[PDB]
Design a protein around this nucleic acid. Structure first.
Lengths: 463, 463, 87
DNA sequence: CCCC
């Protein structure tokens, strides 16, 4: 009864067509989940799958009208939706899915279970995924040159390893890492190595991501971040030199939220998935227009203190404190990298680092202590704290400090506040941040006389 | 079974229809690969190929319904995508492909391997593609007149025919070229000669691709530059008079990238390859909004200094600085050029120039010296270097130079910088340049005081 | 902006004959701009709109073209008839 | 798509 309905039933039982929340159908032809908005591929799937059906069913699929009828039945059979790209522990290649937690490579129906849509763009070879090869030794030497293995560099090396390993996992990342370094220090070597390692999943973005309005009008620089697993910002137009817009804290906050606000061109949709690790390259100390408790909770830094400079200007990179170590430049490294010689060696190193840091939950951690910009706001947390349980039954001692009691609230004259705050830190070295805080957190008991609803830790610590 | 499926299988086995990565169906009719979105050619290919199928199959291809059925089968059979236009040293013609590195002309299945989907639009003629001819002498005379072979015109002529010969290369170029010069000098004659020589691979586009947003809405002014080996946006809107929008350096940077963003109407293909040698006709020096070292490496300029005028205006041309040679105008030259008389002669000229410049790699080189706008940044780059690792055991002597030591980082105050750098540039003519430099380079120690993290080369060289 | 490129593509042809009703004859004749004053034709617009002069003007244009048909047809600028170009 |  209705042979074509039975053909549709079998093609449905093979689980080769799925319906997504976008309304599109993702089909499995040629060992990959494909979909196309302007041209469905269900009839291509029917023609390709005609081989697995019984002998009497294969002849009915050589007519375009019958394949269109089968496609109509299949479309009317799909009601429930599914989810795509939900396994962050899997790396999708062009001919399979690699498992980071195990190391084995799956192909065909073994890669079919994970509904992976994006891909790295190149095939996977088992021969090059080995730990004994002169590409491996050369890459290890290069990485040791980039990051010294000294006891002083232990924390920096560890966090560099963690950050580079976290470019494989396909989930949201809660921090933005600063690859602080200088010219000819090897951050470009890391960029090229990572691009060669993860293929099409690596995208490089300019300054517009950092200090420009993300929403504004049209902005393709954000929509490209959809499902990419690494985002790189380079050639930063220094904010230390005046004339450039400061880093927008709201931009960093939006880029850390699991959903990214941003729209493509000629697109009716606004939401695009965010799995990207965002690493910022800089030769220069960063700055922020506004700084809030939520901000320095999403910032970590890596410092590169090794040079590869030509012998002509060696003392030019040797005779000051800013940059510490100087090695010899290598010229053929860029050509060898572009020839993708160490791609699989770097892939093996990345998987090894992930396995070393695959503790049950993967999570990046911020280290705001290494940014002098926050060094004024991470110390004022040790200086100023807000109102808490009970200062009321101790007003006898704070009165002599200059504090005044107003409607059962302890306030402070501005001059007395400055006098109490000037003791721990210099009024000139930190003076700009000082009067910035003064004008930022001043409360008006009136227009003329200003008061503050804060008491120092000093006044709390000192009886 | 299903005769029409067998016909589709045979037409697929002949390897005449391919699916491109952009989604276009390219067909092989009349010894060339053609694709057209609005008038698909698969049915034309079926009708033309009907002569190679057996006698029993050729009679079914005279009905449009059966041809549409065969086209449906073919469309369902093409799953994988191929790579096109990957050979950068092949000049495609209407009846074959000419090898530039050898000079041999291919046709048929020999030219089928190179999937060149663009063509000059005219057929190749070996008899006219010869070294000796009266047309050859005439054309050589005109080219000698436009650019003389004098020793004062050696480098300029060399850049002229290097840029002209690069128009045959099907690969992305790194620089933009402005033909600067006065009217009645040969820019239009050179443009029309090149147009006649290289056929449809030549495109004249608008001023939009320079000063307007490239994304915008549908932009046919960029979607037509797909795989075009030369692009001529002439008639620069001279910016000397206020009211002309300056060319955005962002657009210059984007044009060099091997892809551009642009969509045609009623279509969804947004990626266009960039094989173009951007040549901009002008009579005045171009001016950009922002000038930096990134733009410094992407500008090339060629000049024309030979006049062609009627006998009445001969004396004025003889009495001008702008012109180094005066010749009587040829009245029918434009007509004979439009008649495509010098087509193959100029083709041979360009091919010989390409062979003469045929190093295994063909890279274009920029000319920074010949731009008045670029004079300021060039001299500055030879005077200062950034704060480097050269300056701990030199703080003893730079203190007398005005520099101060802040956290072992050498900085210069604004007044000292002014009184040390004013000796190389004057205040009046370079007033805006100096003001922009000092405000885009200034760094603040606090709100009031400011300094510079820059040291001149002379101070570093000085002990 | 005026340059040598703009000076090679501009030509000017001047008109000085005035047509007016008899009421405004003297006022027109008291002006240097006009060298000749003639009487207006009222049905001229209608007979022109009726395509009456079609083939006559076609023959006139063909005769003028044949008179000026040297093997190449080229238009020549007249830079001397513009005050802005004088400098 | 133009059009705002």
């Amino acid at each position: 009864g209705n042979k074509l309905f039975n053909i549709a039933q079998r093609i449905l039982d093979t689980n080769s067509v799925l319906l997504t929340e976008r309304g599109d159908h993702i089909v499995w032809i040629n060992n990959s989940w494909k979909f196309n908005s302007e041209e469905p591929l269900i009839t291509k799937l029917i023609l390709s799958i005609r081989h697995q059906l019984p002998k009497e069913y294969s002849s009915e699929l050589l007519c375009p009208r019958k394949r269109k009828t089968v496609e109509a039945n299949i479309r009317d059979m799909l009601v429930d939706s599914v989810e795509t790209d939900t396994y962050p522990d899997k790396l999708p290649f062009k001919n399979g899915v690699l498992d980071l937690v195990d190391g084995m490579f799956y192909s065909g129906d073994d890669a079919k279970k994970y509904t992976c849509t994006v891909s790295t763009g190149f095939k996977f070879d088992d021969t090059k995924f080995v730990e004994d090869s002169p590409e491996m030794e050369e890459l290890m030497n290069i990485i040791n040159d980039i990051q010294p293995l000294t006891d002083e560099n232990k924390k920096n090396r560890e966090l560099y390893e963690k950050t580079l390993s976290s470019c494989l996992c396909g989930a949201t990342k809660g921090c933005l890492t600063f690859f602080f370094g200088e010219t000819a220090t090897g951050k470009s070597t890391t960029k090229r190595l990572l691009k060669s390692a993860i293929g099409d999943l690596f995208v490089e973005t300019g300054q517009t991501i950092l200090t420009d309005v993300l929403d504004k009008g049209p902005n393709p620089f954000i929509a490209n971040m959809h499902l990419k697993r690494s985002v790189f910002c380079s050639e930063l137009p220094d904010f230390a030199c005046s004339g450039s817009k400061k880093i927008r804290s709201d931009n960093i906050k939006k880029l850390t939220e699991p959903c990214v606000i941003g729209r493509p061109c000629f697109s009716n949709k606004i939401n695009n998935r965010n799995h990207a690790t965002i690493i910022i390259d800089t030769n220069y100390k960063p700055v922020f227009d506004r700084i809030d408790n939520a901000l320095m909770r999403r910032i970590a830094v890596v410092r590169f203190r090794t040079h590869f400079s030509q012998p002509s200007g060696r003392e030019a990179a040797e005779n000051n404190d800013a940059y510490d170590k100087v090695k010899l430049l290598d010229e053929g490294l860029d050509g060898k990298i572009q020839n993708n010689r160490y791609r699989f060696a770097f892939l093996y190193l990345l998987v090894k680092w992930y396995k070393k840091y695959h503790i049950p939950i993967m999570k990046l951690y911020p280290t705001p202590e290494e940014i002098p910009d926050f060094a004024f706001y991470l110390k004022i947390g040790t200086l100023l704290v807000s109102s808490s349980v009970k200062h009321i039954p101790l007003m006898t001692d704070l009165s002599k400090k200059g504090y005044i009691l107003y409607d059962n609230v302890v306030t402070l004259p501005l001059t007395t506040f400055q006098q109490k705050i000037s003791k721990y830190f210099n009024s000139r070295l930190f003076g700009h941040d000082i009067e910035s805080f003064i004008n930022r957190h001043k409360k008006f008991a009136n227009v003329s006389d200003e008061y503050l609803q804060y008491i120092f830790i000093e006044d709390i610590s000192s009886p």
